RNA sequence: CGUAAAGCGCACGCAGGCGGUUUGUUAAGUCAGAUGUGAAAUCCCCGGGCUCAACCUGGGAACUGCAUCUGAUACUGGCAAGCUUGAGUCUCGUAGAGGGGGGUAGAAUUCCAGGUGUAGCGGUGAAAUGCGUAGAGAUCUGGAGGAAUACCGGUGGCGAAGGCGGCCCCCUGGACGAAGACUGACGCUCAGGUGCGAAAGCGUGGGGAGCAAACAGGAUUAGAUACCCUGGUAGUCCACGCCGUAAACGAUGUCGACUUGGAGGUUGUGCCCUUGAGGCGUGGCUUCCGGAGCUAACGCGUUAAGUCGACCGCCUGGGGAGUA
């Protein structure tokens, strides 16, 4: 799916350390990176419906995590969306 | 008492889950019966059989497999109890009144041979009907003088003789059976786990039972 | 998803009784222990115990009388989809009082007879016969 | 609600419904008591009076409700802090016709050109139409083009369903296993809605070998607008868009827990290891037979149509009619 080097970079950037992978920010950041990457894939492969279904799951999963984070702590949620530049 | 043999069972493929409590383990792919559990049940069974014997009760042995067909007959000679050595006719107890006339026919057939009134020139009178003697006694030989339903049942195989078990349950006669790993329990009021086909195992059972009835009968 | 753990507790007992199992085990909770305690006093279950601290497991020692299940019939009454509350005078009696109904009152979980004597209503948990 | 009427073709999901476990707190729901109110009559209970009754009438109960006040805190809800078993992320691997794009290979049908060669070929129950002395069929050589991937191949595999088989490359989704770490209820279901959805069909532009609706002829038959035969167009193929229906079937909605067994297939993994085309374990998926139980019966049976929980869909005699 995503390269290990790219995955490791995001975890350190958004997580507490290189070992904090379960954080809601790392999870959202990982999903956001994949969705952005797949934009080029579906730009050319418009008919790849089977792979698109997988993409929609990432979109749905990200929204579920985002809403949970907003409920838990609004201030931290606001920073996360600002850094990733989503929710437009 | 506990001794060699008997512990052996059948293949684990054909085991009956209902008998899980009485299996000690799976040795060499064949279940082996828990003798330490068999003895308390086996020993108590003879105690009850002795108690029924003390009441002048009638015990009936049920053995159909050829590995024990002759064995049950020998017990019927050591003690004066009844037995079945061949196929169990469907309904030997549920409709014993129907089977009564069959017994009477055997008595009349038996009588004719004794005094020689069957010695006639015609082959029909001499050969065709006398063969009914062999056919009848091989199935009703041990039940000729029962004169009624039995007060207890002894069965060497709880699945191969499931017809016999059903009749006893319907009539309420207590059932004592050697129920094997693959056999079906819950149809017998007394459970005696162990082998049901080994020659050295079967002979021990009826040989053991044949003694207690004699002691109880006195 | 498991949305009503109580019916899981009742279902396990019913399934365990049908299968003639000696005992049944499941995740433990304060509410489950309270119901388990009530059953123990009434004599429906022989004994109960709780093992573990971080993930405690509740263990119920089922009992049988004359080779048949003691719990003839157990069924959930109040459910998350439809919850049942009864007043002091509306407390039901199972099998004309032969059975018991577990009711959670302000003073704790107790049988309907105890709640009626104490003059308190509350949620009706289940009927046990 | 498998087969009698009844599970959307399948999914993702807002509103809604419901929600693991621990402590504290709130006391809304809930529960206890009291107060006010709930007209009288009527119903009901115990009495009274018309000679009895109907009828009349005293008292009580009832009016299951609503509102307040005072308490209770088990349960549900709100709030705060938690927790790891639900769910999810990360690390290392494995299998697979999962999807999209491109390239390529072999067998073969048809067609075209040529060589050899001569009277049949083809087809059927029989026959004819048809093809052939303008040289067919057969046979060899060369070329052109289209479509599908023999053997492997398997109640085998993958996918939400529909569905997906030569080989190679690029892009890409999901599942599963091993231990370890991390987040700490972030979950389940889903009206409306949105997406996907065999084949046929439609629009535009290509392609078109084979097959083949329609159509034509020859047979069959009392007739044959059929079955059979010789031909043959759309279509079947590609790009894009539309259509949104199937016996879209397991005639069985999704999620979770629980409940005797036996024999296989397939794909990970641990352990014993010299007495290996071995021995004992632990996961995922899957086929068959069967116990209790269930079912009108047939049958289902740990992949339930058994025992339960959450939510949604749908049914209410047949026809008229899934029609106006
Ligand atoms: Mg992933
Ligand atoms: Mg029908
Ligand atoms: Mg139907
Ligand atoms: Mg869904
Ligand atoms: Mg809760
Ligand atoms: Mg309140
Ligand atoms: Mg009134
Ligand atoms: Mg009067
Ligand atoms: Mg009155
Ligand atoms: Mg609370
Ligand atoms: Mg909708
Ligand atoms: Mg089509
Ligand atoms: Mg077209
Ligand atoms: Mg066209
Ligand atoms: Mg044709
Ligand atoms: Mg339909
Ligand atoms: Mg089918
Ligand atoms: Mg349907
Ligand atoms: Mg369906
Ligand atoms: Mg079956
Ligand atoms: Mg219509
Ligand atoms: Mg239609």
PDB file of C-alpha atoms (C1' of nucleotides) in Angstrom, chain A residues 68 70-74, chain C residues 30, chain D residues 20-26 76-83 185-186:
ATOM      1  CA  UNK A  68     -13.975  10.775  17.524  1.00  0.00           C
ATOM      2  CA  UNK A  70     -13.217  16.184  17.804  1.00  0.00           C
ATOM      3  CA  UNK A  71     -15.430  14.780  20.562  1.00  0.00           C
ATOM      4  CA  UNK A  72     -12.451  13.813  22.728  1.00  0.00           C
ATOM      5  CA  UNK A  73     -10.502  17.070  22.363  1.00  0.00           C
ATOM      6  CA  UNK A  74     -11.565  19.866  20.014  1.00  0.00           C
TER       7      UNK A  74
ATOM      8  CA  UNK C  30     -20.621  -6.040  38.847  1.00  0.00           C
TER       9      UNK C  30
ATOM     10  C1'   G D  20     -17.909  -3.557  26.450  1.00  0.00           C
ATOM     11  C1'   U D  21     -15.674  -2.741  31.421  1.00  0.00           C
ATOM     12  C1'   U D  22     -14.103   0.353  36.434  1.00  0.00           C
ATOM     13  C1'   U D  23     -14.499   4.654  39.904  1.00  0.00           C
ATOM     14  C1'   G D  24     -16.636   9.254  41.167  1.00  0.00           C
ATOM     15  C1'   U D  25     -20.513  12.621  40.498  1.00  0.00           C
ATOM     16  C1'   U D  26     -25.513  14.337  38.672  1.00  0.00           C
ATOM     17  C1'   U D  76     -30.522   3.455  31.828  1.00  0.00           C
ATOM     18  C1'   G D  77     -29.003   8.467  30.536  1.00  0.00           C
ATOM     19  C1'   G D  78     -25.730  13.245  31.354  1.00  0.00           C
ATOM     20  C1'   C D  79     -20.707  14.661  33.186  1.00  0.00           C
ATOM     21  C1'   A D  80     -15.335  13.587  34.772  1.00  0.00           C
ATOM     22  C1'   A D  81     -11.392  10.313  35.081  1.00  0.00           C
ATOM     23  C1'   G D  82     -10.040   5.422  33.711  1.00  0.00           C
ATOM     24  C1'   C D  83      -9.154   0.452  31.863  1.00  0.00           C
ATOM     25  C1'   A D 185     -15.203   2.132  22.942  1.00  0.00           C
ATOM     26  C1'   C D 186     -13.088   5.405  18.282  1.00  0.00           C
TER      27        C D 186
END
